[PDB]
């Protein structure tokens, strides 16, 4: 349970009047970014937050092929159905992988992808005015 993330929340979400759910967005596409560089394998991963306990957790997904040509970013028909039976060609499979800590890095770093996204923003907004 990070407070400190909880408590950038706020200040973004007064300083960019946007509710706190669409920074946590942009708070995981961060950390998966920088997720995947572990890796180095070019692999998708997608990283949840939880507001009420104020930690997010590492996942890494990968989409069903039938002749996966890359691993790192695709999983075959026969291990999705391992994974899921349910899973077919053209589905997406869920894993958990390994997290960072968010005191691993200052709430600074975080802050250069808050403007990054806000910026993209000005460009136009769904609701002006």
Do not use: H
Not at 18 to 27: M, Q, S
Not at 32 to 56: C, H, L, M, N, P
Not at 83 to 111: C, H, M, P, W
């Amino acid at each position: 349970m990070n407070k400190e993330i909880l408590a950038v929340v706020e200040a973004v979400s007064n300083e960019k009047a946007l509710p706190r759910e669409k920074i946590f967005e942009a708070l995981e596409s961060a950390l998966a970014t920088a997720t995947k560089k572990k890796y180095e394998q070019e692999i998708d991963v997608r990283v949840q937050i939880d507001r009420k306990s104020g930690d997010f957790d590492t996942f890494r997904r990968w989409l069903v092929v039938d002749e996966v040509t890359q691993p790192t970013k695709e999983i075959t028909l026969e291990a999705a159905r391992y994974e899921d039976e349910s899973l077919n060609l053209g589905d997406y499979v869920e894993d958990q992988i390994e997290s960072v800590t968010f005191d691993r890095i200052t709430t600074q770093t975080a802050k250069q992808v808050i403007v990054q996204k806000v910026r993209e923003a000005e460009r136009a907004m769904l609701v002006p005015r």
